[PDB]
Amino acid sequence: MGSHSMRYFYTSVSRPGRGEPRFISVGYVDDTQFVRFDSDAASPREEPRAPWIEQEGPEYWDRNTQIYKAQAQTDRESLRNLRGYYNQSEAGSHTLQSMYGCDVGPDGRLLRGHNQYAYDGKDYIALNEDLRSWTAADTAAQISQRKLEAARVAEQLRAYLEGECVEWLRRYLENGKDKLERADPPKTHVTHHPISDHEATLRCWALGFYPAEITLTWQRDGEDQTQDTELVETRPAGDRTFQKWTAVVVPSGEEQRYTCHVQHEGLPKPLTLRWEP
Amino acid sequence: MIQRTPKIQVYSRHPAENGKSNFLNCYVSGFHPSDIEVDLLKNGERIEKVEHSDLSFSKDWSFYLLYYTEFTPTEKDEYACRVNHVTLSQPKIVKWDRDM
Amino acid sequence: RPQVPLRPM
C-alpha cells in the first residue's frame, strides 16, 4: 500500500508579560521529519531536517518562512481571543496546537484531509472529513465556528488540502525517492534474562526499523501469550529509525516453548523468532 | 486539570559494547504542557553537550522530545536521565539499563 | 509547503 501522508504540527504557547507567544512548527512526510521553524531562534526561518529537502532553493525557504511568521501572528490573535472566550486570566500561559495535512493512495490522490486544533491539550475545533464543515468541542469553540463559517474558511482549507498539499507531497516523494519509498525492516533478536531463580524473562527486540508501525507478539500455535508481558512504547533511535521490544516471563526451567512474531512493512513475510544460546 | 505527566525511556541507539562509541537517548513523551527540563547525567553529574529534537506531538496532543548525546559506555560508568515538569513535585531520575 | 494562514479563532 504505497500510500503516504504529509503533516504539519504547530504549537503556540503564550508567555504573558514576556512578549509574544512562542511559535513552533514541524513538518513530516510519513514518519520522517523534514522541516522546522522556531520563532525564538535568533533568526527565525524554516530549516531543513532531512537530507532530501535541502535541494529546494532559497525562494522555497523564504516563502515558507513568511508563511510561518504570518501564522505566528494569527495564532497570537487566536490565543488572545480564546483567553476571552473561557474567561481566563491575563497572567497565565496557554497552548494552541494545530495539526493538518493529507493522506494519499498509490495514485497520489487525496484520500483524507485533516485540519484540527487543541487548546490547552484538549480538542477545540476540527474540520470534518467532507472538508466543508466543522465539529466544535464546546460552547467556546462554537464562537470560533461561527467566525469560520461566516468567512468560508473551509473553502481556503479545502483548496490547500486538495490542491496544494497532495502536489507538494508528490514532489517531496520525488526529492526523497529512496529514503521515503523504502521501508527498513527491523534487525531482530531475542535475549535471555534470568530473574535469578526458577523463572526468567525473554525480551524480543526490534531495532532500526522505518516506518514506526510494527507489531510484536508472543504467542503459542496461533494463540496468544500474555500471562505477563511488558511491551514498551515504540521509540526513536535518533537516526530516523525506531525501536521496540516486548517481553514475557515463562516457566523458565526450559520452557522455551514460546515464540516471538514480528510484522512490519519491510518484512516480505511475517517473521517468527526464538531464543538462541 | 489538563496536565499529563511525562513518560521516560532511557536507552542507547545501538546495542552497547564497552569502549565503542554510541548515543545515549532520553525519550520523554505523553506530557502536557510543553515546558520541560531534562538532563542527561553521568555518575550524578550533568552532561554539558546535550541536544534535543524539535518539539512535536502525538495524536492525543501530548508532546514528545528526544534528548541525546554522544557517549562511549564503560562497564563501570552509570548514566541516568533527570526530568522536571509541572506535573512532578520533584525531578524524576531514570537510570540507563543497557538491557532495556 | 505549509498552508497560508486562515482567519483567527
Numbering used by the authors:
A (entry chain A): 0 to 276
B (entry chain B): 0 to 99
C (entry chain C): 1 to 9
Sentences from the paper on this structure:
We next analyzed the structures of HLA-B*07:02, HLA-B*42:01, HLA-B*42:02 and HLA-B*81:01 in complex with the well characterised RM9-Nef epitope. Pro2 and Met9 acted as primary anchor residues and Arg1, Val4 and Arg7 pointed away from the groove for potential TCR interactions. Despite distinct selection pressure at position 1 of RM9-Nef by HLA-B*07:02 (R71K), peptide residue Arg1 was in a similar conformation in all 4 HLAIs. However, the altered conformation of Leu6 in the RM9-Nef-HLA-B*81:01 complex, compared with the other three complexes has similarities with the conformational switch described above in relation to TL9-p24. Leu6 was in an identical position within HLA-B*42:01 and HLA-B*42:02, but moved by 3 Å in HLA-B*81:01 and 1.5 Å in HLA-B*07:02. These differences were mediated by polymorphisms at residues 156 and 152 within the α2 helix. The larger side chains of Arg156 and Gln152 in HLA-B*07:02 pushed Leu6 up compared to the smaller side chains of Leu156 and Val152 in HLA-B*81:01, changes which may be linked to the L76V/T/I selection that is mediated only by HLA-B*81:01. The other two major differences in RM9-Nef peptide presentation were located at the junction between HLAI residue 147 and peptide residue Pro8, and between HLAI residue Tyr9 and peptide residue Pro2. The smaller side chain of Leu147 in HLA-B*81:01 formed no contacts with Pro8, whereas Trp147 in the 3 other HLAIs made multiple interactions with Pro8. Finally, these data demonstrate that a substantial alteration of the conformation of peptide residue P6 in the HLA-B*81:01-RM9 complex is, as with the TL9-p24 Gag-HLA-B*81:01 structure, associated with the differential selection of escape mutations observed in vivo.
